[PDB]
Structure 1
Amino acid sequence: GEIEFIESSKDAGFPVINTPSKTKLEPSVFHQVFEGNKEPAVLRSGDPRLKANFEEAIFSKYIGNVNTHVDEYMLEAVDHYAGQLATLDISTEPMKLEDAVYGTEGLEALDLTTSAGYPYVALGIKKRDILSKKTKDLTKLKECMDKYGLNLPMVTYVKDELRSIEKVAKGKSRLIEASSLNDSVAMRQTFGNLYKTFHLNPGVVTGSAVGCDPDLFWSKIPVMLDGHLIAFDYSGYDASLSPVWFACLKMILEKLGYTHKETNYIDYLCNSHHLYRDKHYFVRGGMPSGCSGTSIFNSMINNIIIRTLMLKVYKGIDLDQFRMIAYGDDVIASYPWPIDGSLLAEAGKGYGLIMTPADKGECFNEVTWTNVTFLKRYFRADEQYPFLVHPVMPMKDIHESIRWTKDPKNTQDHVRSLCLLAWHNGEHEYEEFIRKIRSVPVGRCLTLPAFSTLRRKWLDSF
Structure 2
Amino acid sequence: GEIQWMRPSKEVGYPIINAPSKTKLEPSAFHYVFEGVKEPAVLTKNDPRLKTDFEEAIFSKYVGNKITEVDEYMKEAVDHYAGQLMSLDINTEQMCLEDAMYGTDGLEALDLSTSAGYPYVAMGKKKRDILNKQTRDTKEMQKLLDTYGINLPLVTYVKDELRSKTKVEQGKSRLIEASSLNDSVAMRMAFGNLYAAFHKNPGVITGSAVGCDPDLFWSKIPVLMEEKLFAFDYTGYDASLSPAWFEALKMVLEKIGFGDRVDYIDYLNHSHHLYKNKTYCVKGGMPSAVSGTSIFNSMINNLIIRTLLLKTYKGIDLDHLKMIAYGDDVIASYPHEVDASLLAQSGKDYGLTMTPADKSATFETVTWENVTFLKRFFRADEKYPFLIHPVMPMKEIHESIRWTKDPRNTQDHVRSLCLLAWHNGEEEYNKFLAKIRSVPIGRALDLPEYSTLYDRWLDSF
What corresponds to 1:23 in structure 2? 23
- 1:225–1:334 Cα contact (<8 Å) kept: yes
Please show how residues 23-172 of structure 1 align to structure 2 within 5 Å: 23-172=23-172
Deviation of 1:226 (Å): 2.5
Give, in whole Å, the separation in 2 of the partners of 1:170 and 1:323: 37
Deviation of 1:207 (Å): 0.2
Deviation of 1:288 (Å): 0.4
Give, in whole Å, the separation in 2 of the partners of 1:144 and 1:249: 29
What corresponds to 1:396 in structure 2? 395
Opposite residue 10 of structure 1, the aligned amino acid is K
> 3-state DSSP class of the match of 2:257?
coil
Deviation of 1:365 (Å): 3.3
- 2:24–2:405 Cα contact (<8 Å) kept: yes
Deviation of 1:67 (Å): 3.5
Opposite residue 107 of structure 1, the aligned amino acid is L
Summarize deviations over 1:10-64 as a string: whole Å, max 9, x none: 2122111001111010110110111100001110000011112111110000000
Deviation of 1:68 (Å): 2.5
> 3-state DSSP class of the match of 2:30?
coil
What corresponds to 1:251 in structure 2? 251
Give, in whole Å, the separation in 1 of the partners of 2:242 and 2:200: 29
What corresponds to 1:405 in structure 2? 404
> 3-state DSSP class of the match of 2:331?
strand
Runs of 4+ in 1 over 4 A off after TM superposition: none
Give, in whole Å, the separation in 2 of the partners of 1:289 and 1:424: 30
What corresponds to 2:219 in structure 1? 219
What corresponds to 1:277 in structure 2? 276
- 2:273–2:281 Cα contact (<8 Å) kept: yes
Give, in whole Å, the separation in 2 of the partners of 1:109 and 1:347: 40
Q: Which moved more, 1:449-458 or 1:129-138?
A: 129-138
Please show how residues 307-346 of structure 1 align to structure 2 within 5 Å: 307-346=306-345
- 2:103–2:109 Cα contact (<8 Å) kept: yes
Unaligned runs of 5+ in 2: none
- Residue 231 of structure 2 corresponds to residue 231 of structure 1: yes
- Residue 288 of structure 2 corresponds to residue 289 of structure 1: yes
- 1:322–1:334 Cα contact (<8 Å) kept: yes
Q: Which moved more, 1:384-393 or 1:430-439?
A: 384-393
Deviation of 1:368 (Å): 1.3
Unaligned runs of 5+ in 1: none
Summarize deviations over 1:325-349 as a string: whole Å, max 9, x none: 0000001000011100011101110
Give, in whole Å, the separation in 2 of the partners of 1:450 and 1:352: 48
Give, in whole Å, the separation in 2 of the partners of 1:181 and 1:12: 21
Opposite residue 408 of structure 1, the aligned amino acid is P
| Aligned length in residues | 461
Deviation of 1:366 (Å): 2.4
- 2:67–2:351 Cα contact (<8 Å) kept: no
- 2:107–2:192 Cα contact (<8 Å) kept: yes
Structure 2 length-normalised TM: 0.99
Give, in whole Å, the separation in 1 of the partners of 2:411 and 2:68: 52
- 2:157–2:275 Cα contact (<8 Å) kept: yes
Give, in whole Å, the separation in 1 of the partners of 2:286 and 2:40: 24
- 2:230–2:365 Cα contact (<8 Å) kept: no
- 1:246–1:270 Cα contact (<8 Å) kept: yes
Give, in whole Å, the separation in 1 of the partners of 2:423 and 2:67: 46
Give, in whole Å, the separation in 2 of the partners of 1:112 and 1:277: 23
Opposite residue 352 of structure 1, the aligned amino acid is G
Deviation of 1:290 (Å): 0.6
Deviation of 1:371 (Å): 1.2
> 3-state DSSP class of the match of 1:258?
helix
Give, in whole Å, the separation in 1 of the partners of 2:364 and 2:449: 40
> 3-state DSSP class of the match of 1:257?
helix
> 3-state DSSP class of the match of 1:49?
coil
Give, in whole Å, the separation in 2 of the partners of 1:446 and 1:420: 14
Please show how residues 257-272 of structure 1 align to structure 2 within 5 Å: 257-259=257-259, 261-272=260-271
Deviation of 1:255 (Å): 0.3
Give, in whole Å, the separation in 1 of the partners of 2:227 and 2:16: 53
Deviation of 1:199 (Å): 0.1
> 3-state DSSP class of the match of 1:380?
strand
Give, in whole Å, the separation in 2 of the partners of 1:364 and 1:350: 19
Deviation of 1:370 (Å): 1.4
Question: Share of identical aligned residues, percent?
Answer: 74
- 2:5–2:280 Cα contact (<8 Å) kept: yes
What corresponds to 2:197 in structure 1? 197
Opposite residue 293 of structure 1, the aligned amino acid is G
Summarize deviations over 1:227-254 as a string: whole Å, max 9, x none: 1111100000000000000010000000
Summarize deviations over 1:255-303 as a string: whole Å, max 9, x none: 00113x4100000000000001110000000000110101000000000
Give, in whole Å, the separation in 2 of the partners of 1:354 and 1:266: 23
What corresponds to 1:360 in structure 2? 359
Deviation of 1:459 (Å): 1.1
Summarize deviations over 1:387-427 as a string: whole Å, max 9, x none: 11111111000001100010011111111111111100000
Give, in whole Å, the separation in 2 of the partners of 1:199 and 1:227: 26
- 1:66–1:351 Cα contact (<8 Å) kept: yes
Give, in whole Å, the separation in 2 of the partners of 1:443 and 1:118: 41
- 1:270–1:287 Cα contact (<8 Å) kept: yes
> 3-state DSSP class of the match of 1:36?
coil
Deviation of 1:172 (Å): 0.6
What corresponds to 1:13 in structure 2? 13
Opposite residue 219 of structure 1, the aligned amino acid is S
Deviation of 1:219 (Å): 0.9
Give, in whole Å, the separation in 1 of the partners of 2:444 and 2:85: 49
- 2:226–2:320 Cα contact (<8 Å) kept: no
What corresponds to 1:305 in structure 2? 304
Structure 1 length-normalised TM: 0.99
Give, in whole Å, the separation in 1 of the partners of 2:166 and 2:373: 22
- 2:4–2:280 Cα contact (<8 Å) kept: yes
Query: RMSD value over aligned CA atoms?
Result: 0.8
Give, in whole Å, the separation in 2 of the partners of 1:330 and 1:4: 28
What corresponds to 1:431 in structure 2? 430
